[PDB]
Amino acid sequence: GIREKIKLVSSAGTGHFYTTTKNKRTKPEKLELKKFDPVVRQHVIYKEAK
Amino acid sequence: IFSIFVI
Amino acid sequence: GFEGGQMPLYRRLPKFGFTSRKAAITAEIRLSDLAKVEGGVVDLNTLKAANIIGIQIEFAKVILAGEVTTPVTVRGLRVTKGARAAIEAAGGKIEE
Amino acid sequence: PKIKTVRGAAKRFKKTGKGGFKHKHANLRHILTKKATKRKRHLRPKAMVSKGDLGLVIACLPYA
Amino acid sequence: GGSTRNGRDSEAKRLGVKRFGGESVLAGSIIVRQRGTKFHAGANVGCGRDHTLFAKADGKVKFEVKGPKNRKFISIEAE
RNA sequence: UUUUGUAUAAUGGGUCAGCGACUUAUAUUCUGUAGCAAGGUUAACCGAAUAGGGGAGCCGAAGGGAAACCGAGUCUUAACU
RNA sequence: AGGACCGAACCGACUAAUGUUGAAAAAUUAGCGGAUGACUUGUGGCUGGGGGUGAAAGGCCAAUCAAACCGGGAGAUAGCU
RNA sequence: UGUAACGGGGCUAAACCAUGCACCGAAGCUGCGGCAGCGACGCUUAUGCGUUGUUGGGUAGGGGAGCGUUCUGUAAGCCUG
RNA sequence: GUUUAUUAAAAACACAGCACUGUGCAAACACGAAAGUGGACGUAUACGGUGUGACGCCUGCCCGGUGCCGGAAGGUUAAU
RNA sequence: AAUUCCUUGUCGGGUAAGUUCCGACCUGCACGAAUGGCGUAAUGAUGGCCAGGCUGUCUCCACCCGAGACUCAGUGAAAUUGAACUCGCUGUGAAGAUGCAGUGUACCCGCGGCAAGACGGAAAGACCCCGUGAACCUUUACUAUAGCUUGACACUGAACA
RNA sequence: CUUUAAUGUUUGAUGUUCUAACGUUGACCCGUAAUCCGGGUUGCGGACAGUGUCUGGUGGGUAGUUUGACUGGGGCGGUCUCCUCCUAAAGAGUAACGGAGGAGCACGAAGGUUGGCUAAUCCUGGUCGGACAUCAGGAGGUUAGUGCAAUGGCAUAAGCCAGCUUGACUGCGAGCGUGACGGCGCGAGCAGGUGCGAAAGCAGGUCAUAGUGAUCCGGUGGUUCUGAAUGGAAGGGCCAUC
């Protein structure tokens, strides 16, 4: 049912990425939020969100 | 048895 | 392995192998050896000749597996922190 | 003739020191994004085959 | 017509009780569907996400009752 | 014999005699027993042929890790209370 | 003249009884059909097994046929008795 | 199918209620003798005695100990016209 | 007329007659790795296949489906 | 109706009486035109119905002649069979008893007769289901495949447009 | 050192012509008194036809196979995993083709924190206004609400509203619960970094219990861990994910 899976890439150049889902249909603006990147061990902005 | 019977 | 038609343990669980192949040609040496090397020089092979390694081997550590007495010089091998200490403390010498 | 190791099992267990066997957890190969980090986290480190399955594994790996 | 069906086991219920060994952090009382049939208290609290009541430090389990009209409260008496 | 259960009206046998069904080989593990012991044992083969020789090799004395590697530790992690 | 008529030989096999450890692994007796025809018969030939042959029934292919018989794979396999 | 709804005879108590004392009755309990396993205690320990307490139904099945048959040695022995 | 030799002789099969369809001959078609042979020492008034079944009076509507015949356009499409 | 379930439909005929039959109706559960429709002389060991004759088919069986059955002599089978000292009844019971309980009855043994019982004999059910059974048959089941068919390259060349 | 165009080429498509591969189950000749074959001459056909390899189509003509289980016989029907109540006998657990209902999600706020707030229903009064809109007081005291079934919870609210936010964080995990097992669940605390709060604090998703899929094969990103002489690379492993 509708809600699709998204990747969340670290804005640091590291390849790290969290993973989750969102409603592609109702909220098209690309989700971003501060999350902990563990290869640099700093809280950093994560972009990509459909 | 057969068959003849039855049945 | 068959456990009724149920998916068997050795199939429910994932594979995780990867075989070193380099490991296959590395031996490990106990302190208890070397005294039996015959010639006070414990060499790249030599151990090999004392039948404590096996021809194909190309690498070897010396490992604190206890008990070395006769002073011995080990050459071309690797040797643990504890083994070096035991060798040296028995009048031994560890040249690369 | 020599027994043949049940080759599939050979690629999923390794005899340990005291004679145990250790394996990789299931449930960690795909459809992951929906699983708690805590759960997935606990599924990384290998674990011992239970007492109940020992019988099976050994019969699969006579030359373990 | 079209009946059958049922949830599984699920368990739920006191698992430690009274004076109990109550080691370090036992899940003494798992009747979730709770924060209610039982309540966090003394040297035990936690009260996990599925309302499980569990030891927070070693000792004996208790079971009391208090002043917001009744209410049960499980707690751990240091031994 | 088979069965929850058989005098069963459920199976099998007319009777006697002879024959008639858990073996053999090779692997592996456990118990007993024997040898020796941090060592134990040789395979083919030689052979004065059950001896003697042959230690190629196999098992064990070190483990941990997918692995490099490290080693009475090691793996996990930047790091472990 | 006639796959014409009545009717023996000859060829068939509609009914009945008998027979059913038979006289006979399909007959005997009394009746019955065809009887110059797509008739009937002696001898010899050809067609072979997923193949033959079949005015067609799955009929027949040596008392065997929804895949002949003999030998082989062979101690097929049998979670059944 | 034939009395066929105390098992029968038969019963007016040989039926029913209460109280009580008898007795019959089992491979249960006890007594006498005996075997075997496990205990302990005493005689006495390459043990076996004596007590003594106790245990000994049994299918699938697990464990233990044995009889006898064929054949090799022991055996050019031993038995045997 | 034929048939289930041995529980079915019939309304079943066959039949002459009818129709469709294939086949131009080195025929279609069948047996056959192939050579070859049958079809036939025949040739469309012939031959194979299929359905129907003497004769009499007749055989209506539907080509959307499936099949077959025809279709030098275009769309999609194999090795290469 | 070789098609009609309802159905012995309804009407007419034949019979003392007719679920069949003959003739009709049409409400054709669910005829129909070459997997031919409706007719049809003749033919049929073809199906259904009727009548005359005929009769032991029947009422209802009698007698007779022959072949067995029975007796003697000779020869001499068969299937089946745990073992038999192998009764009735009512009851019990792996639930339909010669064999258990209770009870009744019954001297021992043939021969000729009869089939109610020995869940009689005979074939390790075919129907019923079951087996991760078999085989043949079907198809727009699956995967292949002979055949048919398509193009490319080879055998395979030259011209001119 | 050309498109609006054309002479020499190496090269496809189509159409005519030729003979010389190839066909000839036309004729004649010889082997040869021979309807086989071969050679020969010749007519016909002719780079077609046919055949080999490759290839798309068709292919019950032929072959091998599959065609589930439960089940108050079997078939037909229904059912097959997950959550909730009862049956269930006051710990857990507990069957039937027993009785009733849900699920295969939703939410970047519907999550975190901080501050604040408190319902249903009825009586009385009140323009349009009624049995039931909004206001007022009073009863009542959660009979309301909860993102969805049912149960158990919830006022310190888990219910209602708002500000700031990303803790729906990475590595770990004393100790527990629950499973034959694979597995699933709960968890204080430690380390790093973060949010809200004056602060004590709280936060490792949501009031909780459904919202799901083993392994294999493979994709992607990362990763000096491996790299079949050596350096690389392929491939593999590991971490993340499909």
Ligand SMILES: CC[C@H]1OC(=O)[C@H](C)[C@@H](O[C@H]2C[C@@](C)(OC)[C@@H](O)[C@H](C)O2)[C@H](C)[C@@H](O[C@@H]2O[C@H](C)C[C@H](N(C)C)[C@H]2O)[C@](C)(O)C[C@@H](C)C(=O)[C@H](C)[C@@H](O)[C@]1(C)O
């Ligand atoms: C002539 C000679 C043959 O007799 C007949 O054919 C009679 C006339 C059969 O009945 C015929 C006629 C008839 C009506 O059976 C009476 C018919 O139903 C059966 C199928 O075949 C018999 C009896 C059949 O039995 C019956 O088979 C049935 C499956 C079950 C029945 N039983 C339950 C009692 C059983 O007795 C059956 C199988 O032939 C008996 C088996 C052992 C045989 O094969 C034997 C060798 C017979 O062929 C035979 C005696 O030689």
